[PDB]
Coordinates of all heavy atoms in Angstrom, one line a residue:
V1 N 0.9 -1.1 0.0 CA 0.0 0.0 0.0 C 0.9 1.2 0.0 O 1.8 1.3 0.8 CB -0.9 0.0 1.2 CG1 -1.9 1.1 1.2 CG2 -1.6 -1.4 1.4
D2 N 0.6 2.1 -0.9 CA 1.4 3.3 -1.0 C 0.8 4.4 -0.1 O -0.3 5.0 -0.4 CB 1.5 3.8 -2.5 CG 2.7 4.6 -2.7 OD1 3.1 5.4 -1.9 OD2 3.3 4.5 -3.9
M3 N 1.5 4.8 0.9 CA 1.1 5.9 1.8 C 2.0 7.1 1.7 O 1.9 8.0 2.5 CB 1.0 5.4 3.2 CG -0.1 4.3 3.3 SD -0.8 4.1 5.0 CE -0.2 2.5 5.4
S4 N 2.8 7.2 0.6 CA 3.7 8.3 0.5 C 2.9 9.6 0.4 O 3.4 10.7 0.7 CB 4.6 8.1 -0.8 OG 3.8 8.1 -1.9
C5 N 1.6 9.5 -0.1 CA 0.7 10.7 -0.1 C 0.5 11.3 1.3 O -0.1 12.4 1.4 CB -0.6 10.3 -0.7 SG -1.4 8.8 0.1
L6 N 0.9 10.6 2.4 CA 0.7 11.1 3.7 C 1.9 11.9 4.3 O 1.9 12.2 5.5 CB 0.3 10.0 4.7 CG -1.0 9.2 4.3 CD1 -1.3 8.3 5.5 CD2 -2.1 10.2 4.0
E7 N 2.9 12.2 3.5 CA 4.1 12.9 4.0 C 3.7 14.3 4.4 O 4.2 14.8 5.4 CB 5.2 13.0 3.0 CG 6.1 11.7 2.9 CD 7.5 12.0 2.4 OE1 7.7 13.1 2.0 OE2 8.3 11.1 2.5
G8 N 2.9 15.0 3.6 CA 2.4 16.3 3.9 C 1.7 16.3 5.2 O 2.0 17.2 6.1
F9 N 0.8 15.4 5.4 CA 0.1 15.2 6.7 C 1.1 15.0 7.9 O 1.0 15.7 8.8 CB -0.8 13.9 6.6 CG -1.4 13.5 7.9 CD1 -2.4 14.2 8.5 CD2 -1.0 12.3 8.5 CE1 -3.0 13.7 9.7 CE2 -1.6 11.8 9.6 CZ -2.6 12.5 10.3
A10 N 2.0 14.0 7.7 CA 3.0 13.8 8.8 C 3.8 15.1 9.1 O 4.1 15.3 10.3 CB 3.9 12.7 8.4
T11 N 4.1 15.8 8.1 CA 4.9 17.1 8.2 C 4.1 18.1 9.0 O 4.6 18.7 10.0 CB 5.4 17.6 6.9 OG1 6.2 16.6 6.3 CG2 6.2 18.9 7.1
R12 N 2.9 18.4 8.5 CA 2.0 19.3 9.2 C 1.8 18.9 10.7 O 1.8 19.7 11.6 CB 0.7 19.5 8.5 CG 0.8 20.3 7.2 CD -0.6 20.7 6.7 NE -1.5 19.5 6.5 CZ -1.4 18.6 5.5 NH1 -0.5 18.8 4.5 NH2 -2.2 17.6 5.5
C13 N 1.6 17.6 10.9 CA 1.4 17.1 12.3 C 2.6 17.2 13.2 O 2.5 17.5 14.3 CB 0.8 15.7 12.3 SG -0.8 15.6 11.4
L14 N 3.8 16.8 12.7 CA 4.9 16.7 13.5 C 5.7 18.0 13.7 O 6.4 18.1 14.7 CB 5.9 15.6 13.0 CG 5.2 14.2 13.1 CD1 6.2 13.1 12.5 CD2 4.8 13.8 14.5
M15 N 5.6 18.9 12.7 CA 6.4 20.1 12.7 C 5.5 21.4 12.7 O 5.9 22.4 13.1 CB 7.3 20.2 11.4 CG 8.3 19.1 11.4 SD 9.4 19.2 9.9 CE 10.5 20.5 10.5
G16 N 4.2 21.3 12.3 CA 3.4 22.4 12.1 C 2.7 23.0 13.4 O 2.1 24.0 13.4
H17 N 2.9 22.3 14.5 CA 2.4 22.7 15.8 C 3.3 23.8 16.4 O 4.4 24.0 15.8 CB 2.3 21.5 16.7 CG 3.6 20.8 16.9 ND1 4.6 21.3 17.8 CD2 4.2 19.8 16.3 CE1 5.6 20.6 17.7 NE2 5.5 19.6 16.8
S18 N 2.9 24.3 17.5 CA 3.7 25.4 18.2 C 4.1 24.9 19.6 O 4.2 25.7 20.5 CB 2.9 26.6 18.3 OG 2.8 27.3 17.0
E19 N 4.3 23.6 19.8 CA 4.8 23.1 21.0 C 6.3 22.9 21.1 O 6.9 22.4 20.1 CB 4.1 21.8 21.4 CG 2.6 21.9 21.6 CD 1.9 20.6 22.0 OE1 2.6 19.7 22.4 OE2 0.7 20.6 21.9
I20 N 6.9 23.2 22.2 CA 8.3 22.9 22.4 C 8.4 21.4 22.7 O 7.6 20.9 23.5 CB 8.9 23.6 23.6 CG1 8.8 25.1 23.4 CG2 10.3 23.2 23.9 CD1 9.0 25.9 24.7
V21 N 9.3 20.7 22.0 CA 9.5 19.3 22.1 C 10.8 19.0 22.9 O 11.8 19.4 22.5 CB 9.5 18.7 20.8 CG1 9.8 17.2 20.8 CG2 8.2 18.9 20.0
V22 N 10.7 18.2 24.0 CA 11.9 17.8 24.7 C 12.4 16.5 24.1 O 11.7 15.5 24.2 CB 11.6 17.7 26.2 CG1 12.8 17.1 27.0 CG2 11.2 19.0 26.8
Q23 N 13.6 16.5 23.6 CA 14.1 15.3 22.9 C 15.6 15.5 22.9 O 16.2 16.5 22.8 CB 13.6 15.2 21.5 CG 14.0 13.9 20.8 CD 13.4 13.9 19.4 OE1 12.2 13.8 19.2 NE2 14.3 13.9 18.4
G24 N 16.3 14.3 23.0 CA 17.8 14.2 23.1 C 18.4 14.1 21.7 O 18.0 13.2 21.0
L25 N 19.3 15.0 21.4 CA 20.0 14.9 20.1 C 21.4 14.5 20.4 O 21.9 14.5 21.5 CB 20.0 16.3 19.5 CG 18.7 16.9 19.2 CD1 18.9 18.3 18.6 CD2 17.8 16.1 18.3
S26 N 22.1 14.2 19.3 CA 23.5 13.9 19.3 C 24.3 15.0 18.5 O 23.7 15.8 17.9 CB 23.8 12.5 18.8 OG 23.9 12.4 17.4
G27 N 25.6 15.0 18.7 CA 26.4 16.0 18.0 C 26.3 16.1 16.5 O 26.4 17.1 16.0
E28 N 26.0 14.9 15.9 CA 25.9 15.0 14.4 C 24.6 15.7 13.9 O 24.6 16.2 12.8 CB 25.9 13.5 13.8 CG 24.7 12.7 14.1 CD 25.0 11.2 14.1 OE1 25.5 10.7 13.0 OE2 24.7 10.5 15.1
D29 N 23.6 16.0 14.8 CA 22.4 16.7 14.6 C 22.6 18.2 14.5 O 21.7 19.0 14.1 CB 21.4 16.4 15.6 CG 21.0 14.9 15.7 OD1 21.0 14.2 14.6 OD2 20.7 14.4 16.8
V30 N 23.8 18.7 15.1 CA 24.0 20.1 15.2 C 24.6 20.7 13.9 O 25.6 20.1 13.4 CB 25.0 20.4 16.4 CG1 25.4 21.8 16.4 CG2 24.3 19.9 17.7

């Protein structure tokens, strides 16, 4: 099943909000 059509959805949902997210990064992410 091709769900690549849901990338826009996932992007709006995971990045389009205005909440601060607490998450641990590593040095390569900087």
